[PDB]
Protein: zinc ABC transporter, periplasmic zinc-binding protein
Amino acid sequence: AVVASLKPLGFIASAIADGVTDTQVLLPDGASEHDYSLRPSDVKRLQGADLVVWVGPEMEAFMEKSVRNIPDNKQVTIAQLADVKPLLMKGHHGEYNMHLWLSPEIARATAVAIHEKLVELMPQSRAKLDANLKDFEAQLAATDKQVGNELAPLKGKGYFVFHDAYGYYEKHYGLTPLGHFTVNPEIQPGAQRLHEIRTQLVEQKATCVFAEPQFRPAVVEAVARGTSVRMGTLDPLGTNIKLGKTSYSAFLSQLANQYASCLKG
Ligand SMILES: [Zn+2]
Structure:
């Protein structure tokens, strides 16, 4: 199997490995992209994998050690790919935005790297692997134009988010985010921070504020109450999307819909 750290990376791998080997994802729904704790069973999946796919030590810090052991011909570390380098953005600590799975260009570079490594590992399946990369690239191209069309009219419509995960997607599709607030998903912030957040929402004429799905509706409501800012939801991990050939395209289109549901009109 191909073992991917995060579900969207599993979407990309599942397109390339389709009909050749299974794809498996390590990180559950609602878990921390940085500080999840791998169980011994997860390390064992990793050590047993045909290929491991992850962003790198500045994102999934939780698997850095586990993956040290694994030879280069059996891992794709997306942040380290030569074709990804120039695409890495200043804009989770560290200096560079590591939410790489939301960049269509990096997703393509990721698919290419996975394909190259799988062809080297499984030359008996070269033609199937080639066909799969062909279909992934065709769908990504089609998706890119369609999403690009759907989001173009939303340019200049400002919004805020709670998790600054979206910068690659936003820059690529010309969305205009106003910034983000550090909010606890469980607890509505203290009066002073609630005041500063609400004044920024109003001061900048934000059309929307976008929560993540692990957010209690109450704390979102508290952030938005009495402002005229509409409430939306974004899922940067596509948790409701199943693995398979069309999954990464479905992910990009779903995110666009999620933006457009709130920002529209
Ligand atoms: Zn993040």
